[PDB]
Design an enzyme around this catalytic site. Structure first.
Site, PDB file in Angstrom:
ATOM      1  N   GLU A  73      -5.991 118.160  86.295  1.00  0.00           N
ATOM      2  CA  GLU A  73      -5.080 118.412  87.350  1.00  0.00           C
ATOM      3  C   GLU A  73      -3.720 119.181  87.072  1.00  0.00           C
ATOM      4  OE1 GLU A  73      -5.593 113.829  88.915  1.00  0.00           O
ATOM      5  OE2 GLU A  73      -3.564 114.240  88.303  1.00  0.00           O
ATOM      6  N   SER A 115       7.621 120.019  84.750  1.00  0.00           N
ATOM      7  CA  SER A 115       7.658 120.035  86.248  1.00  0.00           C
ATOM      8  C   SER A 115       9.012 120.069  86.383  1.00  0.00           C
ATOM      9  CB  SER A 115       7.126 118.965  86.727  1.00  0.00           C
ATOM     10  OG  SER A 115       7.673 117.695  86.285  1.00  0.00           O
ATOM     11  N   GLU A 119      -6.180 113.973  83.726  1.00  0.00           N
ATOM     12  CA  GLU A 119      -4.776 114.767  83.633  1.00  0.00           C
ATOM     13  C   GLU A 119      -4.738 116.113  83.444  1.00  0.00           C
ATOM     14  OE1 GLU A 119      -2.443 111.652  85.283  1.00  0.00           O
ATOM     15  OE2 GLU A 119      -1.710 113.837  84.736  1.00  0.00           O
ATOM     16  N   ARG A 127       1.506 103.518  88.726  1.00  0.00           N
ATOM     17  CA  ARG A 127       1.466 103.277  87.256  1.00  0.00           C
ATOM     18  C   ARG A 127       1.206 102.175  86.605  1.00  0.00           C
ATOM     19  NH1 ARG A 127       5.817 105.904  89.977  1.00  0.00           N
ATOM     20  NH2 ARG A 127       6.669 107.719  89.141  1.00  0.00           N
ATOM     21  N   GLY A 132      -0.631 115.886  80.249  1.00  0.00           N
ATOM     22  CA  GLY A 132      -0.936 114.398  80.228  1.00  0.00           C
ATOM     23  C   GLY A 132      -0.356 113.670  81.289  1.00  0.00           C
TER      24      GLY A 132
HETATM   25  O1  LIG Z   1       9.799 110.467  81.037  1.00  0.00           O
HETATM   26  P1  LIG Z   1       9.752 109.549  82.092  1.00  0.00           P
HETATM   27  O2  LIG Z   1      10.796 108.674  82.661  1.00  0.00           O
HETATM   28  O3  LIG Z   1       8.254 108.754  82.019  1.00  0.00           O
HETATM   29  O4  LIG Z   1       9.454 110.725  83.379  1.00  0.00           O
HETATM   30  C1  LIG Z   1       8.239 111.477  83.330  1.00  0.00           C
HETATM   31  C2  LIG Z   1       8.980 112.948  83.097  1.00  0.00           C
HETATM   32  O5  LIG Z   1       9.648 113.329  84.283  1.00  0.00           O
HETATM   33  P2  LIG Z   1      11.086 113.474  84.358  1.00  0.00           P
HETATM   34  O6  LIG Z   1      11.288 115.181  84.886  1.00  0.00           O
HETATM   35  O7  LIG Z   1      11.591 112.801  85.576  1.00  0.00           O
HETATM   36  O8  LIG Z   1      11.802 113.300  83.013  1.00  0.00           O
HETATM   37  C3  LIG Z   1       7.693 114.186  83.079  1.00  0.00           C
HETATM   38  O9  LIG Z   1       8.061 115.432  83.216  1.00  0.00           O
HETATM   39  P3  LIG Z   1       7.879 116.725  82.068  1.00  0.00           P
HETATM   40  O10 LIG Z   1       7.297 116.257  80.933  1.00  0.00           O
HETATM   41  O11 LIG Z   1       6.951 117.650  82.987  1.00  0.00           O
HETATM   42  O12 LIG Z   1       9.366 117.333  82.027  1.00  0.00           O
HETATM   43  C4  LIG Z   1       6.595 113.870  84.068  1.00  0.00           C
HETATM   44  O13 LIG Z   1       5.680 114.744  83.853  1.00  0.00           O
HETATM   45  P4  LIG Z   1       4.828 115.556  84.848  1.00  0.00           P
HETATM   46  O14 LIG Z   1       5.557 116.065  86.144  1.00  0.00           O
HETATM   47  O15 LIG Z   1       4.707 117.048  83.568  1.00  0.00           O
HETATM   48  O16 LIG Z   1       3.311 114.962  85.024  1.00  0.00           O
HETATM   49  C5  LIG Z   1       6.282 112.428  83.854  1.00  0.00           C
HETATM   50  O17 LIG Z   1       4.707 112.115  84.471  1.00  0.00           O
HETATM   51  P5  LIG Z   1       3.667 111.701  83.533  1.00  0.00           P
HETATM   52  O18 LIG Z   1       3.901 110.726  82.534  1.00  0.00           O
HETATM   53  O19 LIG Z   1       2.519 111.253  84.676  1.00  0.00           O
HETATM   54  O20 LIG Z   1       2.941 113.109  82.849  1.00  0.00           O
HETATM   55  C6  LIG Z   1       6.906 111.538  84.444  1.00  0.00           C
HETATM   56  O21 LIG Z   1       6.806 110.001  84.669  1.00  0.00           O
HETATM   57  P6  LIG Z   1       6.387 109.662  86.225  1.00  0.00           P
HETATM   58  O22 LIG Z   1       5.153 110.433  86.911  1.00  0.00           O
HETATM   59  O23 LIG Z   1       5.694 108.264  85.896  1.00  0.00           O
HETATM   60  O24 LIG Z   1       7.393 109.484  87.011  1.00  0.00           O
HETATM   61 MG   LIG Z   2       1.825 114.303  83.610  1.00  0.00          MG
END
Ligand SMILES: O=P(O)(O)O[C@H]1[C@H](OP(=O)(O)O)[C@@H](OP(=O)(O)O)[C@H](OP(=O)(O)O)[C@@H](OP(=O)(O)O)[C@H]1OP(=O)(O)O
Ligand SMILES: [Mg+2]
Ligand SMILES: [Cl-]
Ligand SMILES: [Cl-]
Length: 134
Positions: A61, A32, A58, A2, A42
């Site tokens: 993926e 997810s 992104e 990150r 994204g």
């Molecule tokens: O809101 P955050 O604290 O930054 O956490 C998010 C959130 O995950 P949670 O389910 O834990 O709230 C997203 O989930 P959704 O938007 O799908 O419900 C997830 O997204 P994805 O799994 O869809 O990728 C995302 O990841 P990202 O910012 O990479 O899209 C993840 O953050 P992390 O991967 O940094 O934990």
């Molecule tokens: Mg994502």
């Protein structure tokens, strides 16, 4: 790994994946954590990764699409989750059948008219609904 802005906001990139240059229908993917919910595809930028490169990676993926990268729409903050997302237009020209998140977590994708994308994003992802405001 990150990555973060100097104020501690997580760095992200996303695309509005349109079917055509008409920008009338956009591709959303399932959450997810809650697969009955829709999100804009994204995710996190990697170290030293250009935002436009992260955005395209992104959506490959998460959504299994490729196409012609268009304009930066803007940079959008989620105050509660402390992240800052670069949002680009992508005009989809390739739709792949078995992409990383389909294989790994059974992620779904669906085309929405813009007004319907805004509707399904509003409750849990109002900042993502705001990507379409302009
Ligand atoms: O809101 P955050 O604290 O930054 O956490 C998010 C959130 O995950 P949670 O389910 O834990 O709230 C997203 O989930 P959704 O938007 O799908 O419900 C997830 O997204 P994805 O799994 O869809 O990728 C995302 O990841 P990202 O910012 O990479 O899209 C993840 O953050 P992390 O991967 O940094 O934990
Ligand atoms: Mg994502
Ligand atoms: Cl379209
Ligand atoms: Cl958000």
């Amino acid at each position: 790994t990150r990555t973060y802005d100097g104020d501690g906001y997580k760095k992200r990139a996303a695309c509005l994946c349109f079917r055509s240059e008409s920008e009338e229908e956009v591709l959303l993917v399932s959450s997810s954590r809650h697969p009955d919910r829709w999100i804009v595809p994204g995710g996190g930028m990697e170290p030293e990764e250009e935002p436009s490169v992260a955005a395209v990676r992104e959506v490959c993926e998460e959504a299994g699409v490729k196409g012609t990268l268009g304009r930066l729409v803007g940079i959008f903050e989620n105050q509660e989750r402390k992240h800052r997302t670069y949002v680009y237009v992508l005009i989809v020209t390739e739709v792949l059948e078995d992409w990383e998140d389909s294989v790994n977590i059974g992620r779904k994708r669906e085309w929405f008219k813009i007004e319907d994308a805004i509707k399904v994003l509003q409750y849990h992802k109002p900042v993502q609904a705001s990507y379409f405001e302009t």
